[PDB]
Nucleic acid binder design. Structure first.
Ligand SMILES: Nc1ncnc2c1ncn2[C@@H]1O[C@H](COP(=O)(O)OP(=O)(O)OP(=O)(O)O)[C@@H](O)[C@H]1O
Ligand SMILES: Nc1ncnc2c1ncn2[C@@H]1O[C@H](COP(=O)(O)OP(=O)(O)OP(=O)(O)O)[C@@H](O)[C@H]1O
Ligand SMILES: [Mg+2]
Ligand SMILES: [Mg+2]
Lengths: 267, 90, 237
DNA sequence: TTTTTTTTTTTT
């Protein structure tokens, strides 16, 4: 009675007590600019993999940038994988979102905001085109070992994966990402494009392009919705279909302030 | 027969080389559009391999990209002349 | 844009390094409108290259010269020399290809033309004609990815004209109607799309929508009218 | 044996 079959609570009781003691530490950093996400996702917890998807040109990158900027203010060290937008335009968008005002109008205040934003724990990767899973993941481990980052975002898996036996390399890379997340306790965010819909159906959790493993092994399936008008549709809606921790599903409308390029509070 | 332009690598030289090639016999002298400097700096910078490969791999002056209304002028004028022949038998 | 005031308040101009896709009903005037846009852009600074994979280079040149002349040039051949000479100095180029060609040979000509003429606007007509030759729905994605990589590594505005799938002739063309995989819709920066109001006799009243806009996201439509005499798409009326 | 993507027929 000494092999790898772990014994009962006689040695696991202490871990359970420790987890139950810090109930406010299991659910980690909360959101400041997003009161709705504080009552749905119950916060941001390390070691979980989440997938993001939405209609074409619906603002997936902009919303993720806002969430990352909100989380990076207090404690979270973030790493950005910009596989679609070059690192300068993304930097402009994030800076404009932080400044809460059109920085192009006033270049005299550029120095102050740049200095105040310079010390935040923000990191980027210079990868822009198609890359294999071996080279990108090595930089992830190297950045974890040095800067101690706890929130990595990859932009458009379909872009990086796109190069055979398709519908299988995607499963391999997403499994590698899940293994890296669980072995290191870093919140990995993935933006996976959906399959071709008919533009009049609400995007369900089964619309993820590829095998079903993406929805199976993910912990949060935050998905955007579009109400296609003829002129400036707006009124984007966000749904949370799956939630492993404290399962809760809900939606809430969002409005877009054009001046600040930020997703305002629900109205 | 096959000349190779070796103008300067800076500005106001590559365009001058293009202009000279256009003035001279087109589709007969290939220009050089490499990232290295002139042959003297290339020899100074130990770019002999570059000076032997890039020069030998010079971009041809012409290509299978038909020109603007310097050619095709006759065909357009003809098609605009016998407009009754564009639409055939009634 | 100069002849298109509406496009100055929707796409906010023409920016290098972006790939745009054009689509519309069959025989609705996709080639004519693209010709007008390219002609208006090439006037000031833009050096353009044309892919005439459906229309031979003579008819396309005739249409472009008619649009530039703003009148029926066939009526007055005495004025042909003046407008031909004025049209000669414009930085315009074409490719001699007319039939089916693989992506490896067409792309090399683009690079060769970029290295010489410093072009920043290459237009490809009828991607379905170029792709038409296996594993279909995969070569199209490959060539679209190659075009996107070429555009981002060279910073030249690549315009693509892709046919839509077989519609019912009574439904507005959505952004999901692009024939092939959905890679074109996600991967393109502008999804300029034409609309048709099918009448029984000379319908007209073509409508243009902008479903996607990566830079300064704006969506809007504006009707267009066609001056038959000058073969030009006039200002909205 | 999954997994998109276009196209014709039948029957909820
Ligand atoms: N709700 C909204 N209302 C108006 N404009 C918006 C809204 N959301 C985003 N935009 C605009 O759309 C532009 C593109 O945004 P973004 O880059 O996030 O799209 P994307 O999700 O990356 O597109 P794709 O899905 O094709 O990659 C932004 O410049 C932004 O100004
Ligand atoms: N709004 C319009 N009203 C009347 N005639 C038009 C209009 N637009 C285009 N045309 C005519 O239709 C003819 C064909 O135009 P064009 O070559 O652009 O079609 P196309 O888009 O190439 O067709 P396809 O989609 O089958 O390739 C032109 O000669 C033009 O005179
Ligand atoms: Mg994006
Ligand atoms: Mg056509």
């Amino acid at each position: 009675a000494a092999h790898k079959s772990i014994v009962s609570f006689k040695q696991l009781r202490e871990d359970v007590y420790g987890e139950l003691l810090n109930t406010e530490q299991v659910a980690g950093v909360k959101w400041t600019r997003f009161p709705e996400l504080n009552r749905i996702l119950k916060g941001h917890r390390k070691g979980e993999l989440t997938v993001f998807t939405g209609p074409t040109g619906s603002g997936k990158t902009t919303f993720i940038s806002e969430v990352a900027l909100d989380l990076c203010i207090q404690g979270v060290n973030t790493l950005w994988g910009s596989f679609q937008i070059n690192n300068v335009r993304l930097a402009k968008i994030m800076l404009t979102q932080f400044a809460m005002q059109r920085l192009e109008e006033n270049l005299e205040q550029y120095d102050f905001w740049a200095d105040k934003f310079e010390e935040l724990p923000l990191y980027f990767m210079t990868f822009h085109g198609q890359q294999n899973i071996k080279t990108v993941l090595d930089t992830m481990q190297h950045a974890v070992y040095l800067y101690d980052i706890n929130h990595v975002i990859i932009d458009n898996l379909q872009f990086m994966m796109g190069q055979i036996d398709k519908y299988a390399v995607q499963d391999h890379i997403i499994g590698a990402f899940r293994k890296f997340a669980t072995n290191t306790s870093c919140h990995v965010t993935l933006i996976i494009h959906p399959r071709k819909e008919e533009d009049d159906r609400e995007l369900q959790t089964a619309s993820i392009f590829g095998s079903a493993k993406a929805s199976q092994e993910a912990d949060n399936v935050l998905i955007l919705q579009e109400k296609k008008l003829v002129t400036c549709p707006g009124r984007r809606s966000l749904q949370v279909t799956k939630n492993r921790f404290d399962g809760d599903v809900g939606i809430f409308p969002l409005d877009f302030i054009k001046s600040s390029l930020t997703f305002s509070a629900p109205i | 027969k096959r000349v190779t332009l070796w103008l300067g690598h800076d500005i106001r030289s590559w365009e001058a080389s293009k202009i000279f090639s256009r003035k001279l016999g087109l589709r007969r002298c290939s220009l050089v559009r490499p990232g290295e400097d002139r042959p003297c700096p290339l020899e100074a910078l130990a770019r002999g391999k570059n000076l032997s490969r890039i020069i030998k791999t010079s971009i041809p002056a012409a290509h299978k990209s038909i020109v603007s209304f310097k050619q095709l002028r006759e065909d357009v004028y003809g098609e605009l002349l016998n407009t009754e022949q564009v639409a055939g038998v009634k």
